[PDB]
């Protein structure tokens, strides 16, 4: 699950939304999804999930961005899909350039301790993945 505050980019409208607003408002946004072959595509959100309050850890990425997700949330990394909780400083995660939309890999600068927060999940059509805080994660 993803934490309240997690930002999601809609490649169709070009609008960035906070996930708690997308779920609470059942907003029909599109997200940038990643296929199995790595390619990125725009896909619609067809289901919204309020997962309640849970512990979320933070993955501070080179550049300054930070993803807050449950330790079991899957992230696309240089070694494939892996639970956020298994990732450590130095591991590289897949990130979408906010300027060019290009996919690159950046190192995790720091892994932060857990904190309490409302958490969410979304169902992305067909590919079941999305870009959160610029990072490619499972929906």
UniProtKB/Swiss-Prot annotation:
This is Endonuclease PI-MtuI. It comes from Mycobacterium tuberculosis (strain CDC 1551 / Oshkosh). The chain holds residues 252 to 691 of 790 of the full protein.
């Amino acid at each position: 699950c993803l934490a309240e505050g997690t930002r999601i980019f809609d490649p169709v409208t070009g609008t960035t939304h906070r996930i708690e607003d997308v779920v609470d408002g059942r907003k029909p946004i599109h997200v940038v999804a990643a296929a199995k072959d790595g390619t990125l595509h725009a896909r619609p959100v067809v289901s919204w999930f309020d997962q309640g309050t849970r512990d979320v850890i933070g993955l501070r990425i080179a550049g300054g961005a930070i993803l807050w997700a449950t330790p079991d949330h899957k992230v696309l990394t240089e070694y494939g899909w892996r639970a956020a909780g298994e990732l450590r400083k130095g591991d590289r995660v897949a990130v979408r350039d906010v300027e060019t939309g290009e996919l690159r890999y950046s190192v995790i600068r720091e892994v932060l301790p857990t904190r309490r927060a409302r958490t969410f999940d979304l169902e992305v059509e067909e590919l079941h993945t999305l870009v959160a805080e610029g990072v490619v994660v499972h929906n």
